[PDB]
Amino acid sequence: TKTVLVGFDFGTNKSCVLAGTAGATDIAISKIVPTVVGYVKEGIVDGIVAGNRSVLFGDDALQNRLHARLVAPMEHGVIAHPDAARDFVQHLRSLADPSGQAEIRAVVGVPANATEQAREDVRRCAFGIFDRILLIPEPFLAALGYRDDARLGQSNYIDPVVNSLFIDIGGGTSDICLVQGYFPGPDDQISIPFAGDAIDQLLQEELNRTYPNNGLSLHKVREIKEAHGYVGPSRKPLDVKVVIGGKAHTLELGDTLARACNALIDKIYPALTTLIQRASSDSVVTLLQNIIITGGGSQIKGIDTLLQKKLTEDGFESPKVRLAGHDYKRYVALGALKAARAARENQWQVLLG
Amino acid sequence: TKTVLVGFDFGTNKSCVLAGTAGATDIAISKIVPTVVGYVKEGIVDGIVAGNRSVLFGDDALQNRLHARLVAPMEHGVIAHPDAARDFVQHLRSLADPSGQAEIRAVVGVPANATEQAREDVRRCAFGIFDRILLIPEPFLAALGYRDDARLGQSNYIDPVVNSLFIDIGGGTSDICLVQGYFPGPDDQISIPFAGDAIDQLLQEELNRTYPNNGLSLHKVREIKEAHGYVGPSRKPLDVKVVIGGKAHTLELGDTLARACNALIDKIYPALTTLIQRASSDSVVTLLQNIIITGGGSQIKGIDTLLQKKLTEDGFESPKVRLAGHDYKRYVALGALKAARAARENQWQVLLG
Amino acid sequence: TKTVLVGFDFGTNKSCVLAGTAGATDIAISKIVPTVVGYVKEGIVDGIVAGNRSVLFGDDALQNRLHARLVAPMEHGVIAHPDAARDFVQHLRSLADPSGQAEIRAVVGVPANATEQAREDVRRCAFGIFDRILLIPEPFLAALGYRDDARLGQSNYIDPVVNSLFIDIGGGTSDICLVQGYFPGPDDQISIPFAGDAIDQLLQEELNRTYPNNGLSLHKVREIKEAHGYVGPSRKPLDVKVVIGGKAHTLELGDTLARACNALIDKIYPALTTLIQRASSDSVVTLLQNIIITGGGSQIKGIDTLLQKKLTEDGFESPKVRLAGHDYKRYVALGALKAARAARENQWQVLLG
Amino acid sequence: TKTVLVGFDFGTNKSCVLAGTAGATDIAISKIVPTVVGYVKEGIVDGIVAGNRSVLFGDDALQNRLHARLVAPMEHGVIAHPDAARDFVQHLRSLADPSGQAEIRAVVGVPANATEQAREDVRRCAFGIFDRILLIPEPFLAALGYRDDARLGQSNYIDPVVNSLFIDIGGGTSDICLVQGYFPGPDDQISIPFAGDAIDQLLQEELNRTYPNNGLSLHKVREIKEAHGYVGPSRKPLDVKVVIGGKAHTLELGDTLARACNALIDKIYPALTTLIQRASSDSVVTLLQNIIITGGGSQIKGIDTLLQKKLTEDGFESPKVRLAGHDYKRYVALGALKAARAARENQWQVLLG
Ligand SMILES: Nc1ncnc2c1ncn2[C@@H]1O[C@H](COP(=O)(O)OP(=O)(O)OP(=O)(O)O)[C@@H](O)[C@H]1O
Ligand SMILES: Nc1ncnc2c1ncn2[C@@H]1O[C@H](COP(=O)(O)OP(=O)(O)OP(=O)(O)O)[C@@H](O)[C@H]1O
Ligand SMILES: Nc1ncnc2c1ncn2[C@@H]1O[C@H](COP(=O)(O)OP(=O)(O)OP(=O)(O)O)[C@@H](O)[C@H]1O
Ligand SMILES: Nc1ncnc2c1ncn2[C@@H]1O[C@H](COP(=O)(O)OP(=O)(O)OP(=O)(O)O)[C@@H](O)[C@H]1O
Ligand SMILES: [Ca+2]
Ligand SMILES: [Ca+2]
Ligand SMILES: [Ca+2]
Ligand SMILES: [Ca+2]
């Protein structure tokens, strides 16, 4: 049979699976599936769900979220629902391996400091799916996939892995990591369970507190944040057109979005400065010049400017906070695929049980 | 009152206690008790442990390791847990003295270059237990106990004490010693804290790295090494039948045991050659012909052949590495008993305070 | 006053009270009273209930269930109706102490992982009834009462407490517990609120869904399950003679009972294997040989064979699932009485308030 | 500007701040604030807390512990909550400096062998508060503050610093120190994280084990120990009047307080005798005559007599265990102020960040 190395980014909001053979460098499969499993509701009529499938994954479960009970397999970057997570990894295996006969060797991205229970949860929802697994911190894989191997060696290209600080603000955890060329130790990374889902929850609370029984689902309170959420000083007026009870209302969520998204900064800044002061004095001056924000939370309006302003005001020697880029979804999966093709035979973990 | 001279081999894995009267040469008591103390767990049901004992020693603590919290009194050939060590020495005193009224004079075996703190640790967990103590290095006691006094003087018997090199590869330390007829000086012996427990730890790491959350206890990772561990070139395939999570699996640990046990050789060979080149040039040609491996580590499959091969390949004049024999457990205790019966009245150390 | 140690198995379906003096080993009082309180209905004619009692307990409330409103004090192994539970414990106190003057010291059996609120519920409906209380998990007490103290020490008697796995499938909870010689920790036991009452509810739903308005009470849907309920493959045809609307009908409930009782296996097997894989690898090979099912749910037709089959096909090393025996009702009460006579003076909890 | 030298005793139960100018010997500010920070709860009605303060410190937080969430900044003599500790040191700075404009130079008392992390926790919660810091072990500062400089030189006054052994039994740690005239080395002191809060925890466990759901807060289980706690043989009957569930009960806590308080002796005695045997033989005969107990734990009923009895029974040459005195709270702050006024310009540590 053939072996398929799979860079797997098991996220709280969206997972991304990449599949390629050994020796080569191209990417056979590259899918970005929202981490959600929809169990088609009991009593569903035939023809409502295309193919009468009883379990939907990703967008197929988000479009049919009216007919399906949605369950997010992952919460705070760790597996919260083992059965849904197993179903979802089983779906993504068929995605990364359409034939279903190849031996999958997956490097799955775990949070920065994932507890051994949170790692056995991933090694248990991957048994019988992935033949060999390898659990690497998510921000290190983000640094490894953001790195342009085609542009290495050049002088006009600064390596994001040689000396940088990666602030992978996902949708479950916000992992900061001191990526200093090698596999980061337990002290080179800090994971805060406050990210996109926490800002969604804060907006849900500040909406059910001022506009009670609004009925706005978390999937819409998330779109409000993705479209209008911002960090920094309040922006008023900021009219958000919502649908509350069938009727179209226009809420004023300037202060609401400001307080919801600035809590993320207030959470990740004490851990940003902690790792900045944990770095070696010889290398921190360039570490400040190479601070990179990845993950979905990098798309928050004005987060790099606010973080660089807060690091400059605190006296850090000329920080330069940078955004990862447009491909913030595949960075952890690209890094996990690069770490799969570079993993030694003795590095892969055997999944028995 | 009567005096009982006790040859005590306080080991990291097994301690062997011998007891005999003065003047005679027979051996009254001879016990080999695994150095372990199991404190019966809180809430134990009556009748689970025979006699409702709350502290179990040796095999009684290994058979009842499910109901008892086991603590190893000794780590790296030095007392690591003083309370468990004192409990264990108190048990072995009752073993060497069932009446409990005789004055015990014990020669305890310490590592090759045991620090004065590591020796006061043994003289402190023996106060009130042994009336007089005498601390002699463990490999010299192994040389003394391996020596056959019934076969001395004969021409067809080579004395292991007259001029030999003893590599007592224990379970905590691997002490190499130039046994040249007399009490070895501090430069005639080298102690490396790498032995059976270090190979057990290396196997535990190599198993939790490839077969994560295997749950194999150290007492089973140790039996794997005793049954299949080997030094030399890798032997594949070498199937080890284990029980991981209730289910019976068959792991492939050829390279694993190879890398685990060859680290012991890589550790003890720089100290083997150091003392071979420290010996007098007049006597080193005979030293190489009398290289003897004792301790549990002598039972590793193919360790004398590997060490003789490494010593011949390095150009040493015809080395002949030999195993101690089947009685590798009592050799330090036999030597300590022979050193107790030959100790002058001024050699015994008084334990006060 | 005299002290009476009372082993109390407060069950969801039946509670077993045992009473004995201190120091002795005989059992003075031993009653099995169905956990139910029948409050005699308003307007009851004199002479309908023997003695004109207004509150009936156990069988006296089951025979007079036409004249009394029955309330089950316990649901899911925890006290659900505090007033009925206090009345019922007050009745069982008079059962264990007919004189009503002795100081009762009761060891009540709680579920495996009973929350502190579920324990204060039992310590609150026992205040003024039991002078000292002691709450121990129900499966551990089943292990302690199944143990035959007359045959301890013998070689031909395997101890159910030294190392075993007890599946106390009651009528409210199904508690699995790693009984390994000592008081089980919070991780050695899992309690699932799915047992006899859950299968009763599943049968009630599957009967009100196919045979609507059948009028079969839960007390008859329960007898259907006790008489014909089975786990494993469906058995058709399986005719159950019932009385629906006064008329005698003969339903076909092969698939119905199959699906109702196999849900219990589907619920308790993920928690069975969880503790099988939680046990130490040194003792799991014996744990699988000593898997014991107690409680009412042990009487389900073919549950030990089915669970042994499911554990064998999953690769567990030669499991051997055994049934507790005929005396499955007194095992928790016998164990609580053995734990009362062996409880230290500082183990008894004082009930004030 | 003016400089204010501040002897700061940052305790687990009570922190004492002393402030004085340079050159003089009088004490400008002397406050004893219980180390607690009460964050006023959300939704507090105006007028409940005097001044509508949102953060209360010391007694102001203990009197309003019903309206405020109390957090102890310090646990085991080290800073456990950095934010509450920073607020608390900020309050104590305003206490030692009402004007808030003077340059504060604080000598803060750390435990005996405070780890460098536990010292950077104090230098980090003091940055921007104290301009210069100096961390000295707490028992040495207690020895320095117990010293009567007004009585030095006299013949009828034995100096507590020239040669003594201080058992500062605080509320977080119980530090024993060989105070032999100079700054004690790392081997002249032992810190045990078992003191007042550990006895409070032991009493809480022994009360929730015998009188379950008693609801007695730690602040009341602490007053029980302060009013009735004793070391030595059990004192029965010892009736303690408590309030359990609104109702006034009278518990018997003779054995309870005995076992709770004698654990402190059993913990601090192996470290007491360790330093007694670490002292020079020339000075140990005087050291035993000058054994002094300070800190809150010195107020335990019969602790000096019990420790002197235990030291005499062990054969130590005529020990004389003495209590510090009534002013056991300001001794560490008095010594820290005496060491601030005697600290050289190069001894002060600059706090930058
Ligand atoms: N433009 C935006 N503004 C604000 N938030 C956004 C934006 N785009 C995405 N997000 C948030 O980012 C989250 C997704 O994060 P991302 O996809 O970067 O990493 P992730 O895979 O979710 O991280 P993890 O692996 O920790 O789950 C979503 O929950 C979403 O709420
Ligand atoms: N056949 C074998 N193969 C490999 N290792 C073995 C074998 N037999 C014993 N050992 C190892 O030897 C170790 C101890 O045996 P031995 O009695 O020779 O040393 P020891 O006296 O316990 O050690 P020390 O003197 O350092 O305390 C054990 O930990 C065990 O792992
Ligand atoms: N032969 C049988 N077949 C199927 N179910 C049975 C049988 N006998 C009893 N049961 C069920 O077992 C339940 C009683 O369980 P048991 O008496 O073993 O413990 P319990 O007191 O219910 O414990 P708990 O209160 O923790 O549930 C009853 O509800 C009944 O439905
Ligand atoms: N009379 C008493 N009996 C018993 N314990 C007491 C008594 N008085 C005070 N305590 C205990 O002493 C503790 C306070 O110790 P003290 O004030 O002597 O030093 P501390 O500053 O708290 O110690 P640290 O500096 O280690 O925090 C309190 O927790 C209290 O429980
Ligand atoms: Ca991510
Ligand atoms: Ca040895
Ligand atoms: Ca039961
Ligand atoms: Ca103090």
PDB file of N, CA and C in Angstrom, chain A residues 265-327:
ATOM      1  N   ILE A 265      -7.473  41.165  23.900  1.00  0.00           N
ATOM      2  CA  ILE A 265      -6.184  41.827  24.069  1.00  0.00           C
ATOM      3  C   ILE A 265      -5.777  41.825  25.535  1.00  0.00           C
ATOM      4  N   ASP A 266      -6.713  42.159  26.425  1.00  0.00           N
ATOM      5  CA  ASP A 266      -6.438  42.149  27.857  1.00  0.00           C
ATOM      6  C   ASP A 266      -6.060  40.769  28.378  1.00  0.00           C
ATOM      7  N   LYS A 267      -6.468  39.701  27.697  1.00  0.00           N
ATOM      8  CA  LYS A 267      -6.088  38.349  28.091  1.00  0.00           C
ATOM      9  C   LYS A 267      -4.740  37.935  27.511  1.00  0.00           C
ATOM     10  N   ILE A 268      -4.502  38.229  26.235  1.00  0.00           N
ATOM     11  CA  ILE A 268      -3.306  37.726  25.568  1.00  0.00           C
ATOM     12  C   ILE A 268      -2.100  38.645  25.740  1.00  0.00           C
ATOM     13  N   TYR A 269      -2.284  39.841  26.287  1.00  0.00           N
ATOM     14  CA  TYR A 269      -1.138  40.727  26.449  1.00  0.00           C
ATOM     15  C   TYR A 269      -0.281  40.348  27.658  1.00  0.00           C
ATOM     16  N   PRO A 270      -0.864  39.994  28.810  1.00  0.00           N
ATOM     17  CA  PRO A 270      -0.027  39.494  29.913  1.00  0.00           C
ATOM     18  C   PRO A 270       0.767  38.252  29.557  1.00  0.00           C
ATOM     19  N   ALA A 271       0.303  37.449  28.603  1.00  0.00           N
ATOM     20  CA  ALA A 271       1.056  36.301  28.124  1.00  0.00           C
ATOM     21  C   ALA A 271       1.958  36.641  26.948  1.00  0.00           C
ATOM     22  N   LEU A 272       1.655  37.711  26.215  1.00  0.00           N
ATOM     23  CA  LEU A 272       2.581  38.209  25.206  1.00  0.00           C
ATOM     24  C   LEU A 272       3.845  38.751  25.861  1.00  0.00           C
ATOM     25  N   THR A 273       3.685  39.675  26.810  1.00  0.00           N
ATOM     26  CA  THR A 273       4.839  40.244  27.490  1.00  0.00           C
ATOM     27  C   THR A 273       5.583  39.215  28.328  1.00  0.00           C
ATOM     28  N   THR A 274       4.884  38.215  28.869  1.00  0.00           N
ATOM     29  CA  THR A 274       5.563  37.171  29.629  1.00  0.00           C
ATOM     30  C   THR A 274       6.570  36.427  28.761  1.00  0.00           C
ATOM     31  N   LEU A 275       6.169  36.040  27.552  1.00  0.00           N
ATOM     32  CA  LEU A 275       7.093  35.348  26.664  1.00  0.00           C
ATOM     33  C   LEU A 275       8.127  36.288  26.064  1.00  0.00           C
ATOM     34  N   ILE A 276       7.787  37.565  25.885  1.00  0.00           N
ATOM     35  CA  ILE A 276       8.790  38.519  25.421  1.00  0.00           C
ATOM     36  C   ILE A 276       9.899  38.670  26.455  1.00  0.00           C
ATOM     37  N   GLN A 277       9.541  38.673  27.738  1.00  0.00           N
ATOM     38  CA  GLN A 277      10.541  38.731  28.795  1.00  0.00           C
ATOM     39  C   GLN A 277      11.128  37.368  29.133  1.00  0.00           C
ATOM     40  N   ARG A 278      10.574  36.286  28.587  1.00  0.00           N
ATOM     41  CA  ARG A 278      11.192  34.973  28.714  1.00  0.00           C
ATOM     42  C   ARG A 278      12.275  34.724  27.676  1.00  0.00           C
ATOM     43  N   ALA A 279      12.272  35.469  26.575  1.00  0.00           N
ATOM     44  CA  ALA A 279      13.243  35.250  25.514  1.00  0.00           C
ATOM     45  C   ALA A 279      14.639  35.665  25.960  1.00  0.00           C
ATOM     46  N   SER A 280      15.644  35.099  25.296  1.00  0.00           N
ATOM     47  CA  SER A 280      17.027  35.448  25.588  1.00  0.00           C
ATOM     48  C   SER A 280      17.283  36.909  25.248  1.00  0.00           C
ATOM     49  N   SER A 281      18.046  37.587  26.108  1.00  0.00           N
ATOM     50  CA  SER A 281      18.358  38.993  25.878  1.00  0.00           C
ATOM     51  C   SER A 281      19.104  39.214  24.569  1.00  0.00           C
ATOM     52  N   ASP A 282      19.888  38.233  24.122  1.00  0.00           N
ATOM     53  CA  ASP A 282      20.605  38.376  22.859  1.00  0.00           C
ATOM     54  C   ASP A 282      19.656  38.383  21.669  1.00  0.00           C
ATOM     55  N   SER A 283      18.493  37.747  21.800  1.00  0.00           N
ATOM     56  CA  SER A 283      17.597  37.529  20.677  1.00  0.00           C
ATOM     57  C   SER A 283      16.255  38.235  20.792  1.00  0.00           C
ATOM     58  N   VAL A 284      15.997  38.964  21.879  1.00  0.00           N
ATOM     59  CA  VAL A 284      14.690  39.583  22.053  1.00  0.00           C
ATOM     60  C   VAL A 284      14.541  40.827  21.188  1.00  0.00           C
ATOM     61  N   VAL A 285      15.651  41.480  20.837  1.00  0.00           N
ATOM     62  CA  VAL A 285      15.567  42.706  20.048  1.00  0.00           C
ATOM     63  C   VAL A 285      15.032  42.409  18.653  1.00  0.00           C
ATOM     64  N   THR A 286      15.394  41.254  18.090  1.00  0.00           N
ATOM     65  CA  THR A 286      14.827  40.847  16.810  1.00  0.00           C
ATOM     66  C   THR A 286      13.490  40.142  16.989  1.00  0.00           C
ATOM     67  N   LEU A 287      13.278  39.513  18.144  1.00  0.00           N
ATOM     68  CA  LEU A 287      11.983  38.913  18.436  1.00  0.00           C
ATOM     69  C   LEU A 287      10.883  39.963  18.420  1.00  0.00           C
ATOM     70  N   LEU A 288      11.174  41.150  18.953  1.00  0.00           N
ATOM     71  CA  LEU A 288      10.206  42.240  18.901  1.00  0.00           C
ATOM     72  C   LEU A 288       9.953  42.692  17.473  1.00  0.00           C
ATOM     73  N   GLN A 289      10.963  42.602  16.608  1.00  0.00           N
ATOM     74  CA  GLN A 289      10.773  42.959  15.209  1.00  0.00           C
ATOM     75  C   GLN A 289      10.030  41.879  14.438  1.00  0.00           C
ATOM     76  N   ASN A 290       9.995  40.654  14.955  1.00  0.00           N
ATOM     77  CA  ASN A 290       9.291  39.556  14.306  1.00  0.00           C
ATOM     78  C   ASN A 290       8.191  39.003  15.201  1.00  0.00           C
ATOM     79  N   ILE A 291       7.225  39.840  15.564  1.00  0.00           N
ATOM     80  CA  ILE A 291       6.014  39.361  16.220  1.00  0.00           C
ATOM     81  C   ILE A 291       4.934  39.182  15.165  1.00  0.00           C
ATOM     82  N   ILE A 292       4.379  37.975  15.082  1.00  0.00           N
ATOM     83  CA  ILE A 292       3.455  37.606  14.017  1.00  0.00           C
ATOM     84  C   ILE A 292       2.169  37.081  14.635  1.00  0.00           C
ATOM     85  N   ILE A 293       1.036  37.570  14.142  1.00  0.00           N
ATOM     86  CA  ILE A 293      -0.280  37.130  14.584  1.00  0.00           C
ATOM     87  C   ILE A 293      -0.895  36.263  13.498  1.00  0.00           C
ATOM     88  N   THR A 294      -1.270  35.038  13.860  1.00  0.00           N
ATOM     89  CA  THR A 294      -1.948  34.152  12.923  1.00  0.00           C
ATOM     90  C   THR A 294      -3.258  33.659  13.519  1.00  0.00           C
ATOM     91  N   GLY A 295      -3.919  32.731  12.834  1.00  0.00           N
ATOM     92  CA  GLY A 295      -5.216  32.264  13.274  1.00  0.00           C
ATOM     93  C   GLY A 295      -6.321  33.212  12.862  1.00  0.00           C
ATOM     94  N   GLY A 296      -7.574  32.824  13.101  1.00  0.00           N
ATOM     95  CA  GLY A 296      -8.684  33.696  12.759  1.00  0.00           C
ATOM     96  C   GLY A 296      -8.625  35.045  13.445  1.00  0.00           C
ATOM     97  N   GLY A 297      -8.220  35.069  14.713  1.00  0.00           N
ATOM     98  CA  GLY A 297      -8.146  36.310  15.464  1.00  0.00           C
ATOM     99  C   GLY A 297      -7.142  37.312  14.935  1.00  0.00           C
ATOM    100  N   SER A 298      -6.311  36.925  13.967  1.00  0.00           N
ATOM    101  CA  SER A 298      -5.453  37.900  13.307  1.00  0.00           C
ATOM    102  C   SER A 298      -6.250  38.835  12.413  1.00  0.00           C
ATOM    103  N   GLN A 299      -7.450  38.431  12.005  1.00  0.00           N
ATOM    104  CA  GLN A 299      -8.290  39.230  11.127  1.00  0.00           C
ATOM    105  C   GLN A 299      -9.108  40.276  11.870  1.00  0.00           C
ATOM    106  N   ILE A 300      -8.992  40.350  13.199  1.00  0.00           N
ATOM    107  CA  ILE A 300      -9.685  41.393  13.945  1.00  0.00           C
ATOM    108  C   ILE A 300      -9.169  42.750  13.502  1.00  0.00           C
ATOM    109  N   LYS A 301     -10.093  43.678  13.257  1.00  0.00           N
ATOM    110  CA  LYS A 301      -9.746  44.982  12.707  1.00  0.00           C
ATOM    111  C   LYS A 301      -8.835  45.758  13.648  1.00  0.00           C
ATOM    112  N   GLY A 302      -7.598  45.990  13.221  1.00  0.00           N
ATOM    113  CA  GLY A 302      -6.671  46.783  14.001  1.00  0.00           C
ATOM    114  C   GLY A 302      -6.078  46.085  15.200  1.00  0.00           C
ATOM    115  N   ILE A 303      -5.799  44.786  15.099  1.00  0.00           N
ATOM    116  CA  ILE A 303      -5.198  44.070  16.218  1.00  0.00           C
ATOM    117  C   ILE A 303      -3.675  44.142  16.205  1.00  0.00           C
ATOM    118  N   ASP A 304      -3.049  44.128  15.027  1.00  0.00           N
ATOM    119  CA  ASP A 304      -1.603  44.284  14.969  1.00  0.00           C
ATOM    120  C   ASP A 304      -1.176  45.693  15.352  1.00  0.00           C
ATOM    121  N   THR A 305      -1.903  46.710  14.885  1.00  0.00           N
ATOM    122  CA  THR A 305      -1.592  48.082  15.269  1.00  0.00           C
ATOM    123  C   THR A 305      -1.774  48.294  16.765  1.00  0.00           C
ATOM    124  N   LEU A 306      -2.864  47.777  17.336  1.00  0.00           N
ATOM    125  CA  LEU A 306      -3.092  47.936  18.768  1.00  0.00           C
ATOM    126  C   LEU A 306      -2.029  47.206  19.578  1.00  0.00           C
ATOM    127  N   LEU A 307      -1.666  45.992  19.159  1.00  0.00           N
ATOM    128  CA  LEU A 307      -0.671  45.241  19.915  1.00  0.00           C
ATOM    129  C   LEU A 307       0.703  45.887  19.820  1.00  0.00           C
ATOM    130  N   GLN A 308       1.066  46.405  18.644  1.00  0.00           N
ATOM    131  CA  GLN A 308       2.339  47.101  18.514  1.00  0.00           C
ATOM    132  C   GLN A 308       2.340  48.397  19.312  1.00  0.00           C
ATOM    133  N   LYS A 309       1.201  49.091  19.362  1.00  0.00           N
ATOM    134  CA  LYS A 309       1.103  50.301  20.169  1.00  0.00           C
ATOM    135  C   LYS A 309       1.255  49.985  21.650  1.00  0.00           C
ATOM    136  N   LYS A 310       0.615  48.910  22.113  1.00  0.00           N
ATOM    137  CA  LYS A 310       0.721  48.541  23.519  1.00  0.00           C
ATOM    138  C   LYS A 310       2.117  48.054  23.874  1.00  0.00           C
ATOM    139  N   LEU A 311       2.817  47.419  22.934  1.00  0.00           N
ATOM    140  CA  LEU A 311       4.178  46.984  23.224  1.00  0.00           C
ATOM    141  C   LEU A 311       5.165  48.143  23.154  1.00  0.00           C
ATOM    142  N   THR A 312       4.884  49.146  22.319  1.00  0.00           N
ATOM    143  CA  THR A 312       5.746  50.323  22.267  1.00  0.00           C
ATOM    144  C   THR A 312       5.550  51.198  23.497  1.00  0.00           C
ATOM    145  N   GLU A 313       4.300  51.361  23.938  1.00  0.00           N
ATOM    146  CA  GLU A 313       4.026  52.181  25.112  1.00  0.00           C
ATOM    147  C   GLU A 313       4.622  51.579  26.376  1.00  0.00           C
ATOM    148  N   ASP A 314       4.764  50.254  26.428  1.00  0.00           N
ATOM    149  CA  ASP A 314       5.345  49.605  27.596  1.00  0.00           C
ATOM    150  C   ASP A 314       6.864  49.644  27.605  1.00  0.00           C
ATOM    151  N   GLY A 315       7.493  50.183  26.568  1.00  0.00           N
ATOM    152  CA  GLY A 315       8.928  50.357  26.560  1.00  0.00           C
ATOM    153  C   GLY A 315       9.723  49.280  25.860  1.00  0.00           C
ATOM    154  N   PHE A 316       9.068  48.311  25.227  1.00  0.00           N
ATOM    155  CA  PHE A 316       9.797  47.296  24.485  1.00  0.00           C
ATOM    156  C   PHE A 316      10.505  47.926  23.292  1.00  0.00           C
ATOM    157  N   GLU A 317      11.747  47.500  23.063  1.00  0.00           N
ATOM    158  CA  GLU A 317      12.587  48.158  22.070  1.00  0.00           C
ATOM    159  C   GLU A 317      12.072  47.952  20.654  1.00  0.00           C
ATOM    160  N   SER A 318      11.294  48.917  20.163  1.00  0.00           N
ATOM    161  CA  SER A 318      10.811  48.980  18.789  1.00  0.00           C
ATOM    162  C   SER A 318      10.165  47.671  18.352  1.00  0.00           C
ATOM    163  N   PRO A 319       9.004  47.318  18.893  1.00  0.00           N
ATOM    164  CA  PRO A 319       8.309  46.121  18.423  1.00  0.00           C
ATOM    165  C   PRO A 319       7.686  46.352  17.056  1.00  0.00           C
ATOM    166  N   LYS A 320       7.480  45.249  16.342  1.00  0.00           N
ATOM    167  CA  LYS A 320       6.872  45.291  15.015  1.00  0.00           C
ATOM    168  C   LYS A 320       5.930  44.097  14.907  1.00  0.00           C
ATOM    169  N   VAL A 321       4.666  44.315  15.247  1.00  0.00           N
ATOM    170  CA  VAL A 321       3.658  43.266  15.197  1.00  0.00           C
ATOM    171  C   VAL A 321       3.143  43.152  13.770  1.00  0.00           C
ATOM    172  N   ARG A 322       3.180  41.941  13.233  1.00  0.00           N
ATOM    173  CA  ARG A 322       2.818  41.657  11.854  1.00  0.00           C
ATOM    174  C   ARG A 322       1.695  40.629  11.816  1.00  0.00           C
ATOM    175  N   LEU A 323       0.843  40.746  10.807  1.00  0.00           N
ATOM    176  CA  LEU A 323      -0.199  39.765  10.560  1.00  0.00           C
ATOM    177  C   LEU A 323       0.349  38.648   9.683  1.00  0.00           C
ATOM    178  N   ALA A 324      -0.124  37.427   9.937  1.00  0.00           N
ATOM    179  CA  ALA A 324       0.349  36.271   9.184  1.00  0.00           C
ATOM    180  C   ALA A 324       0.109  36.453   7.692  1.00  0.00           C
ATOM    181  N   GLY A 325      -1.141  36.626   7.306  1.00  0.00           N
ATOM    182  CA  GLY A 325      -1.490  36.824   5.921  1.00  0.00           C
ATOM    183  C   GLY A 325      -2.885  36.320   5.648  1.00  0.00           C
ATOM    184  N   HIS A 326      -3.212  36.229   4.358  1.00  0.00           N
ATOM    185  CA  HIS A 326      -4.540  35.781   3.961  1.00  0.00           C
ATOM    186  C   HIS A 326      -4.742  34.299   4.241  1.00  0.00           C
ATOM    187  N   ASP A 327      -3.694  33.497   4.106  1.00  0.00           N
ATOM    188  CA  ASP A 327      -3.786  32.045   4.253  1.00  0.00           C
ATOM    189  C   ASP A 327      -3.600  31.624   5.705  1.00  0.00           C
TER     190      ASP A 327
END
